[PDB]
Amino acid sequence: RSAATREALITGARKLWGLRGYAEVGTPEIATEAGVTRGAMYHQFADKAALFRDVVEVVEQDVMARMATLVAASGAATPADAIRAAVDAWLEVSGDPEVRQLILLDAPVVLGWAGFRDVAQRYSLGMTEQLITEAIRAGQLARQPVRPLAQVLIGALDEAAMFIATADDPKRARRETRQVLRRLIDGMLNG
Amino acid sequence: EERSAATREALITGARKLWGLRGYAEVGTPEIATEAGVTRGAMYHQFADKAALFRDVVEVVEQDVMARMATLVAASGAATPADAIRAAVDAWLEVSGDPEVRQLILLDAPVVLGWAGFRDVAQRYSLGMTEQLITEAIRAGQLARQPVRPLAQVLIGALDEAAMFIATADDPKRARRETRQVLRRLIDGMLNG
Ligand SMILES: O=C1C[C@H]2CCC[C@@H](C1)N2CCc1ccc(Cl)cc1
Fold this sequence. Notes:
The structure is a homodimer.
Chain A: H1 2-20, H2 27-34, H3 38-44, H4 48-73, H5 79-94, H6 97-137, H7 146-165, H8 170-186
Helix pairs in contact in A: 1-2, 1-4, 1-6, 4-5, 4-6, 5-6, 5-7, 5-8, 6-7, 7-8
The structure holds ligand GO5.
The ligand O=C1C[C@H]2CCC[C@@H](C1)N2CCc1ccc(Cl)cc1 is lined by residues 60, 63-64, 86, 90, 103, 120, 123-124, 128, 131, 154, 157-158 of chain A.
PDB class: dna binding protein
Keywords: helix-turn-helix, tetr-family, complex, inhibitor, drug design, tuberculosis, ethionamide, DNA binding protein
Assembly: dimeric
């Protein structure tokens, strides 16, 4: 009922905000894309930022699923290589124009730094802590506090992606940033 | 004129003090005007609104953060660029742990300035020092030759997240000790010396 209205609005908002940006598309154009009335939409989402919060949830869920698939298919032979593949998976997925617009450009502005970090952590801390735990278990990473290392790496990888997203020469920014991340990673990983 | 220039300094000092202690959202401009000993009219002549006074508070706090970082690195006795970077990472956790810096820069500024405004201020103050430390370490052969700006930006992301993780931790003393350990391991993995 309401569930069908919400899903149509989220799908339409993800589509139009992904192409043009949050700031460039109003709720009436999203209601049209979804095939619902302004009244039906206002019942589900009091304002534009509320609909954006639900779009970010669905997009970050998809980002983490896509990364998990790339890591499973990468052929990583050890936990250290799984971390390396996860970093390359994030640079790949972050380059999707919709992910760049919604997550790297719009989400920090609409959610703020605190809001962005909360979403980032809820979606990525589990996978990141698992990668670290498996590398420590395999003796390829020093025994150390898992949560602080996970948090710092998430902050480093989110900033890496945002640097590429806003660069004058994204292709060169991506190449140079991948090199930095690989050096940083390899300095923690043993052998 | 002289009284107006004194009024502006009293307002910045008073706002910095009270917002530092209670947070931006908990102190209004009338209380700040009272603290500074000036009328609402004198305050309005200097600052169009509450957020304009906050932008000037952030400037003086960031100036002091970067001065204190430079002082702590000079006080460390670092004799090589690698030791200067180690000292600068320790100095950031020290400076960002100051309760006024936590409140005004880590909690309030991202909300009041918004993302674009906050990052522009953060970059204007932090990118120069970070890039200088990297360039000196590359020149000394203590860091591999590489593009300076991408490495600087990734480390600033790591160091900003470290500070926010400590600022919001249930046990900040333990979060600071553990975060200092992981940052030291991260930089010691890249530094030749
Ligand atoms: O949707 C997500 C969650 C989080 C917030 C928004 C940007 C990206 C993608 N970061 C995760 C980046 C990341 C974390 C860990 C690893 Cl191993 C790789 C990438």
